[PDB]
Structures are given as structure tokens and as C-alpha cells.
Design a protein around this ligand. Structure first.
Ligand SMILES: [Cl-]
Ligand code: NA
Ligand code: NA
Ligand SMILES: [Zn+2]
Length: 285
């Protein structure tokens, strides 16, 4: 068959528009992964992005956009940069010499999706892991046979592998009180009141105690704008330091891991079968 025409919801304008699968996917790669990544990582990424649309088509419509299979909000579906936007911000030379690589990666995987028992998977992906990916159930609510923790030994080379953020004790309590009106916490005794309660083997903080409150690592990531929910806290004199590992949710495919694998000679099928446990590739058209 031919490549489908899909409905894409523009989260800024509120208008839904028809797009050829290929054009949509090029916009997703431009937004998710740079044209500087290896072609095999870009191919892996294109298959994941295509699979996401197919999965969405085969499952329940969302309330955010019931009349569109996907939207342009990276917080809900996946990133998307339009051609006009890319041309205006990067220029014609970038379109002809760099965006062409993105176009070739997408065309190069025409109609290919990742499958588990012959059905499109939920192909979660993120920037950089802590060295191991996360099982879906330690981050999200459900377990999926293809979203299992795997080693990701090349993520250590990512510029987002490690990060640190210093916050004054005063700003730390002020920020928490603003987000949680019931919190009882003392600016002068933070090291005695704040402690990690539950975390996965990969490292995502599931439960953290802050005075009388229990929050998730994701809650903390959100309040303090951290790169991930995998962190540790150092208590200083008058301040705390968040020491953060990786970037993103940690489930499914690591983008920097795919890049590292590509550099080592792995091809996109092997990258995909590594991150998505017991999966195959299917050409639907
Ligand atoms: Cl990236
Ligand atoms: Na194909
Ligand atoms: Na940030
Ligand atoms: Zn969406």
C-alpha cells in the first residue's frame, strides 16, 4: 500500500492538519535528534517515531486531540519542527545539506515499525540514561514486555550524562512550599528531614521523603527543572546540591545510546532490538 496521510494537532494554533507520514516524521527527527547524529541512530529514531503514530492509530483516542492521531507537543506525543520553521531558523543551505540527511533516514526506513508479537509497540524514547534504561513500571504505571531495563554503556559519553544544580536552603523550602501547601519542612534541618525512600536499580527515584511529604522523583524533577528523576541530594551549609544522572524518563530507547551504538558499528535493527526487548521490525508498506 501507500504511506498514510495523518491528522496532526498543532498544540500552539489549536488547528488539526493533514500530513504525509514522511513529512511528519522528518519534522519529528528534526525536533528530537540533530542532523549530526549518525545515520543509524537517525534511522532507529525514525522507526520509533513511525511506530508511535501506528500505535496511536490502533489505540484509544486522547482527550487532548480526539480528532488527531498525534500532536506537536513533546510533553504529550513527540517533538515536531515544521519545514518553514526549520528553513527560517537554519537557512536554505542547512535544508539542502543537513535536513537532507534527516529526509534520507526517514525515507530509508519507509514503512518500518517495531513490533512485539506482530503488533506496533509503544516506542518510548529519551535522551540519555544513567547507564541502564528503566523498566516502564518503575517510571510509569504499566509493565510492557518490550520496555525492560537494559545496559546502555555508551550513554556515559553524552553531554547530558551528569549534571549538578545548587539551590540555597531558602529557595529549596520556598519552592516546595509553593508547590505543596501542606508541607512541613525546616530550612535549618534539611539533611534530617529529606531522604530517598524508594528508587529503582537503574536509579529513578520513585519515592522521596521531604519533611511530612512523600513525592516522586518526577515531582522533584518538575519543581527544580532537573534533567531527570534519577538524582541524589548533597546537604551543604546553607544549600543543597542535586546531583543528577541522565536526561529524560529513561524508558525504552536512549538517543545518545543509539548514537554510541552506531559509532561502534551497530545498525539500526540491532539498536532497536537492544532497547526494545524481544521485538522485530515490520515493513507495513
Ligand atoms: Cl537527542
Ligand atoms: Na517499507
Ligand atoms: Na533543566
Ligand atoms: Zn499528543
Amino acid at each position: 500500500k501507500k504511506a498514510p496521510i495523518i491528522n496532526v494537532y498543532n498544540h500552539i494554533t489549536g488547528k488539526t492538519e493533514k500530513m504525509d507520514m514522511e513529512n511528519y516524521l522528518c519534522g519529528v527527527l528534526a525536533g528530537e535528534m540533530s542532523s549530526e547524529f549518525d545515520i543509524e541512530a537517525l534511522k532507529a529514531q525514525s522507526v520509533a517515531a513511525r511506530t508511535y503514530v501506528v500505535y496511536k492509530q490502533e489505540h484509544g483516542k486522547s482527550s487532548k486531540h480526539k480528532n488527531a492521531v498525534v500532536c506537536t507537543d513533546y510533553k504529550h506525543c513527540q517533538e515536531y519542527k515544521s519545514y518553514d520553521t526549520l528553513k527560517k531558523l537554519n537557512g536554505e543551505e542547512w535544508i539542502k545539506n543537513k535536513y537532507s540527511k534527516i529526509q534520507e533516514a526517514v525515507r530509508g526506513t519507509k514503512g518500518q515499525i517495531i513490533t512485539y508479537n506482530d503488533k506496533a509497540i509503544l516506542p518510548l524514547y529519551f535522551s540519555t540514561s544513567s547507564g541502564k534504561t528503566e523498566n516502564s513500571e518503575e517510571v510509569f504505571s504499566a509493565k510492557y514486555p518490550y520496555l525492560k531495563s537494559v545496559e546502555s554503556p555508551y550513554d556515559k559519553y553524552s553531554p547530558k550524562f551528569a549534571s549538578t544544580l545548587k539551590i540555597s536552603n531558602t529557595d529549596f523550602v520556598k519552592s516546595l512550599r509553593r508547590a505543596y501547601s501542606t508541607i512541613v519542612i525546616d530550612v535549618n534541618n534539611l539533611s534530617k528531614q529529606v531522604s530517598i525512600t524508594k528508587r529503582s536499580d537503574a536509579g529513578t527515584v520513585e519515592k522521596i521523603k521531604l519533611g511530612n511529604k512523600e513525592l516522586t522523583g518526577k515531582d522533584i524533577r518538575t519543581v527544580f527543572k532537573l534533567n531527570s528523576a534519577n538524582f541524589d541530594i548533597k546537604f551543604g551549609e546553607g544549600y543543597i546540591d542535586f546531583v543528577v544522572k541522565g536526561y529524560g524518563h529513561g524508558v525504552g530507547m536512549s538517543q545518545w545510546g543509539a548514537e554510541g551504538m552506531a559509532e561502534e558499528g551497530y545498525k539500526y535493527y540491532d539498536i532497536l532490538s537492544h532497547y526494545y526487548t524481544d521485538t522485530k521490525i515490520k515493513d507495513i508498506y
